[PDB]
Structure formats: C-alpha cells, structure tokens
Design a protein around this ligand. Structure first.
Ligand code: NA
Lengths: 8, 70
C-alpha cells in the first residue's frame, strides 16, 4: 500500500 | 536519537521495533530497518541479497528515520 512508497 | 531495539510506529500506525540503523547498499542516506508486528512489509531484513537484519518474510521494511515515532 501507499505508506510503503519510498521504503525498501 | 533513535536506537536499535526501540519500539516504534511507522507513519504513526504500523508498530514494530528498530533492528537496524545506518547507511545501506540500496539507496543513499540513513535508513531504519524495522521488524513489524504484522507481515505487511517488503522484506525479511535483506534487500537485493544484502543482509541488514533477520526477520520472518514480509515483516521487515526499511524507512527513513523521519517517518518514525518512538
Ligand atoms: Na500499537
């Protein structure tokens, strides 16, 4: 989901 | 500020613990490797074959420290 954008 | 072992929330609503804090091989700058209470993450503590910490599948995620709350 979007909250994981910019995460690895 | 933050420390390995600390109880934290990612984006204020995903609970976990800090298991890694530092630079990595996948992107510049500082990263916090978190083991999440629920298996809603992206990894098992490794990214692109590089091992930063160890957890069960999808319980790990790497995020900027600024996204964490203690
Ligand atoms: Na909680």
């Amino acid at each position: 989901d979007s909250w994981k954008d910019g995460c690895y | 500020d933050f420390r390995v072992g600390e109880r934290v929330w990612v984006n204020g609503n995903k609970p976990g613990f800090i298991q890694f804090l530092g630079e990595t091989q996948f992107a510049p700058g500082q990263w916090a490797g978190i083991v999440l209470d629920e298996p809603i993450g992206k990894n098992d503590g490794s990214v692109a074959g590089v091992r930063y910490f160890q957890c069960e599948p999808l319980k790990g995620i790497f995020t900027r420290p600024s996204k964490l709350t203690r």
